[PDB]
């Protein structure tokens, strides 16, 4: 039956597109965002294990096989997913639908559906046919909705402006129609009978009509631009707010570029809702009026115009697709050239050292020739389309004029009426031409609505977890990890079953090696990600029953790559918690020794930074981080690696301050450096993703094992 193929929105999600295409073929539609979430795609690319897991989840009896060169057997079901290699550069998951003796039906998610020869296909796909069948738990149903009827909801509060624009357009049409008979009146009455003293009056009257059409045009333009801006701003703001509400899985799965790119396509949606909805109504009404006027004036001259419209529509519809197929290749060839140029100018040290000044020149010349060829193909398509449209338009005009003269010869129409018909054709051809060329706008708007409207349908972080405030009013409590398991996506489990307990210890130090996952432990503690199995207990209470806001404000955190906003130090330092008195900032700076570089700055605390504080070095950046952390006065502090500079006096002061707290607050310190944890009370060594040794340093040294060798290697 129907050979459905889903077009991927992003370059990374191929497996999601293939699985959605197969599910649609069997008759089940899902939002591509939800399929992508279930399969768990990383930014690098999709995984086949993710596809097999998603197929199992949806109810598909599924299996992956490493097929040989021979693929002529009948006893295996289709469609099925196999990976290909794009001209031996990178992998690409695609779905095959039906096989013939020499034809293979290969539905490329990137570009439509294609047919491949046996030898070329067998050269292109490495292995791993993914076979799927319905497993009797597969229930058909279409879950998709028309997001356009959801985005058009924004037009409801603005009905007055839309109606006023429509009325203004109607009056504009009426005046334009009325003013088009000036040539008829001129060449039928005023000149034939030489009725002077009436020419001046009629000329003034038709001048007044035109000085009134411009007013309506001006007013309509003002209202339409105001409406467009007003709706575009609302779309953009809703999308941005929901993105800020989305959980961290959404930000780890997607890159920055995609999220920002879903922000520039609000204009496309606005064009459909604001422009392409008003234009449909006004142009349909005005085209109907013009067509009726032309038909009443003369049917014979109307049929020629109708034939011209039909020819123009046929030409445009025929030429629509090859233009897109040629515009995509140009974008690809520019994306290659730009990357080549940036890579070449970035690595000039190596190029100049190795003397490759000619190789890179030749390569860039070849890429420039390729992009020029693609642009020339698009140019040829445009020239062909323009030439055909010009021939149709000119021949139509000449034929209309000749047929009008022929009608006048036999005493059927007057010359002034012929001129009036020629003037009126501008009010019938233009509206219909607008609707003919409106189809690409509607199509691209529909495409852009499926790529911004699927994001809005994800469940945000706040809604899931249940909570009750009666249980534990505070937040600070003994921390207990019980059988916590976690993996970032569908990959090797970073954390295996572990057991931890923090019984109000003065200091906790977590040490390990790169890739162990020491920071991921704290990241899980703050409820950024949820554990698959087991849980974490505070006061003998699960984190899943605690409010998000309290668990998020009472835990102070420091990142490895400290982030500094583009603002003054005062607002940057106390973001999230405004209405803070100068004493709190001054004492936080005193504890963090932030004053030392403050005196050197031209302004004490209102100094405006550059982009992300580029001029400031990382050494003071960490100090800003600890200042921001300690400003909250939290219940639990999670202090990450604060190595900074060899200025050990600053770290000594920080440690002295923390010890001078002498409070019941807990501190969890993540540091790979071995010396700095010498004076710690509880030290957890996380090796290979499992906690190995626990206790104080002195007994850990006498325990032999593995800590002994590193400790006596460092010192």
């Amino acid at each position: 039956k129907k050979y459905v193929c889903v077009r991927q929105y992003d370059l990374t999600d191929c497996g999601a597109a293939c699985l959605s295409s197969i599910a649609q073929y069997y008759g089940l539609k899902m939002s591509l965002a939800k399929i992508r979430e279930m399969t768990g795609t990383d930014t690098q690319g999709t995984n086949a294990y993710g596809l097999i897991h998603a197929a199992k989840q949806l109810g598909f009896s599924a299996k992956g096989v490493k097929a040989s060169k021979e693929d002529l057997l009948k006893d295996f079901r289709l469609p099925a997913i196999a990976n290909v290699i794009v001209d031996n550069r990178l992998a690409h998951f695609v779905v095959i639908y039906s096989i013939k003796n020499r034809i293979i039906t290969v539905a490329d998610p990137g570009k439509g559906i294609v047919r491949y020869s046996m030898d070329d296909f067998c050269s292109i796909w490495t292995g791993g046919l993914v076979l799927l069948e319905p497993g009797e738990a597969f229930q058909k149903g279409d879950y998709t909705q028309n997001m356009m009827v959801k985005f058009a909801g924004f037009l409801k509060p603005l009905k007055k402006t839309v109606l006023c624009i429509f009325l203004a357009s109607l009056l504009y049409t009426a005046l334009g129609i009325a003013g088009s008979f000036y040539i008829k009146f001129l060449f039928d009455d005023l000149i034939k009978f030489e009725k002077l003293n009436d020419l001046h009056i009629i000329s003034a009257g038709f001048a007044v009509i035109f000085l009134l059409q411009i007013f309506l045009n001006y007013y309509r333009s003002i209202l339409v631009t105001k409406l467009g801006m007003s709706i575009d701003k609302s779309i953009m703001m809703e999308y941005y707010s929901h993105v800020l509400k989305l959980p961290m899985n959404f930000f780890n799965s997607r890159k920055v570029g995609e999220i920002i790119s879903r922000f520039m396509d609000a204009s496309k949606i606005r064009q459909a809702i604001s422009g392409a909805t008003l234009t449909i109504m006004i142009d349909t009404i005005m085209a109907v009026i013009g067509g009726i006027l032309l038909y009443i004036q003369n049917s014979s001259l109307f049929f020629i115009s109708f034939i011209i419209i039909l020819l123009y529509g046929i030409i445009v519809t025929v030429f629509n697709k090859p233009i897109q197929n040629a515009n995509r290749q140009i974008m690809e060839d520019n994306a290659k050239l730009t990357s080549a140029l940036v890579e070449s100018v970035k690595g000039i040290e190596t190029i100049k050292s190795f003397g490759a000044e000619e190789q890179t020149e030749k390569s860039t010349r070849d890429k420039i020739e390729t992009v020029m060829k693609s642009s020339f193909k698009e140019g040829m398509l445009y020239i062909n389309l323009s030439s055909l449209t010009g021939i149709v338009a000119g021949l139509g005009g000449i034929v209309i004029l000749w047929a009008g003269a022929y009608n006048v010869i036999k005493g059927n129409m007057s010359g002034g009426q012929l001129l009036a018909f020629n003037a009126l054709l501008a009010y019938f051809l233009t509206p219909v031409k607008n609707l003919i060329d409106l189809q690409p706008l509607i199509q691209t708007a529909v495409v852009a609505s499926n790529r911004l409207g699927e994001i809005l349908e994800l469940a945000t972080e706040k809604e899931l977890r249940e909570d009750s405030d009666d249980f534990v009013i505070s937040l600070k409590g003994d921390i207990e990890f019980r059988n916590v398991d976690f993996r970032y996506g569908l990959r090797k489990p970073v954390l295996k079953n572990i057991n931890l307990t923090i019984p109000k210890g003065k200091t906790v130090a977590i040490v390990g090696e790169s890739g162990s996952g020491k920071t991921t432990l704290a990241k899980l503690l703050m409820n950024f990600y949820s554990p698959e199995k087991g849980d974490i207990l505070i006061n003998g209470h699960s984190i899943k029953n605690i409010s998000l806001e309290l668990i998020r404000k009472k835990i102070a955190f420091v990142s490895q790559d400290v982030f500094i906003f583009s603002g003054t130090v005062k607002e940057n330092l106390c973001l999230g918690n405004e209405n803070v008195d100068m004493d709190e900032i001054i004492k936080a700076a005193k504890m963090a020794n932030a004053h030392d570089f403050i005196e050197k700055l031209p302004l004490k605390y209102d100094t405006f930074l550059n982009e992300s504080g580029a001029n400031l070095s990382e050494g003071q950046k960490q100090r800003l981080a600890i200042a921001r952390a300690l400003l909250k006065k939290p219940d639990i502090l999670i202090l990450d690696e604060a190595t900074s500079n060899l200025d050990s006096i600053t770290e000594n002061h920080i440690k002295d301050a923390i010890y001078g707290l002498e409070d019941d607050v807990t501190v969890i310190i993540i540091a790979h450096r071995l010396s700095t944890i010498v004076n710690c009370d509880k030290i957890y060594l996380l090796k290979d993703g499992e906690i190995v040794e626990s206790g104080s340093h002195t007994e850990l040294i006498a325990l032999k094992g593995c800590y002994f060798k590193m400790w006596k290697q460092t010192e």
Partner: peptide, 17 residues
């Protein structure tokens, strides 16, 4: 079935893009 089945690691090594 068609050919030889695969283990979890053989699926792991296979990626897309």
């Amino acid at each position: 079935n068609i050919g030889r089945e695969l283990t979890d690691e053989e699926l792991m090594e296979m990626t897309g893009g």
